[PDB]
């Protein structure tokens, strides 16, 4: 049972957003259905629409002419269409399974930002250790001036996970985000081992593997 | 046309706590209610469905209560791992589908103070080559989740170029934050010392870096 959303990270105002949820672990049979719920960052969940075995379509009255939902048990997908996108629609969009009714399992959700601003890839700078060496050293990467969210950071291709902490991004008045990811390692380990951050900004189709030397 | 939830509640460790969704004849009265929990940074999880029923694997510290235009979720043996946002859900005969409650943020009151760890990075050699300088002050593992961040240049208060994030709940119920001092390369070289001053619960932790 794995649900998966996919869509554009950035949508311009008044344009159309189209999500598609590819599913696993069932099929629109029985009395089962798949739903769409959104959540603005740090805010409450809002049920949007859902479709059942009947292809019975239910929509939110708050979103009158904007919502169409459709299924395709063939390629096992479920597609929702929202017209006339507004910045108030910026949210994480979840596709969930519904089984009188109840929401059983939730997907990871896709982040969608409705903005008139342009995509911008980040500049990645190393956060080098003097911190006149203590028993541990903090090293990291500064993911600077990007838009929109999100950004993912791993260390050493995911093989280094112990001392990792990626911090939530800051939003400057420029409209550009910046975040820092740092790993705390034993200062004994700064020559034994190389350290590279794997930054991925999918909205700009940019991946950067930056090593942090010294 | 109503679905009211208290935005914040709190209970004592090891005790009981109630989260209530109030409505009318169109929502909870006459239609089933579901409950969902959302831990920080993760997807919601089904708590209670069919008003009273819990699926498998769910803790039996949780339960739902029906009575007219009011639905309630109860949590016995409250523990710190229960701090999360809790939502109710029910259909309404006034609109076409499901309504979510506003959500209730649950706080557990027995947690001890943790003082923040402060890590201050000077600007990189790469960024100075681009004539810019971003000082990075990372604030981790503090409770409760309120800090004041001030910056100093040669001991004197900095009045511009500072941006600090809101505190964010992390894995272990503690909080994290970061603050950035954005300068040019010349401003960075104009002083001998820069300090990140983190005031948590009245005490201050200052870390200093130098261009030299």
Author numbering:
A (entry chain H): 2 to 34, 35A, 35B, 36 to 82, 82A, 82B, 82C, 83 to 96, ...
B (entry chain L): 2 to 7, 9 to 27, 27A, 27B, 28 to 95, 95A, 95B, 96 to 106, ...
Sentences copied from the publication:
To determine whether somatic mutation was required for the formation of the glycan-binding cavity, we determined the crystal structure of the unliganded DH501 UCA Fab to 2.10 Å resolution. In a superposition, the DH501 UCA Fv regions had a RMSD of 0.70 Å compared to affinity-matured DH501. All six CDRs oriented to a moderately large solvent channel, possibly conferring steric freedom in contrast to both mature DH501 structures where the majority of residues in the paratopes of both Fabs in the AUs were involved in non-crystallographic and/or crystallographic contacts. This difference in crystal formation may explain the difficulty in resolving the DH501 UCA HCDR3. In total, the initial VHDJH recombination event formed an initial cavity whose shape near the HCDR2 and HFWR3 was optimized by somatic mutation.
In a previous HIV-1 vaccine study, we isolated a monoclonal antibody, DH501, from a group M consensus Env-immunized rhesus macaque. DH501 typified a new type of HIV-1 glycan antibody that required the N301 glycan on Env for neutralization and bound directly to high mannose glycans.
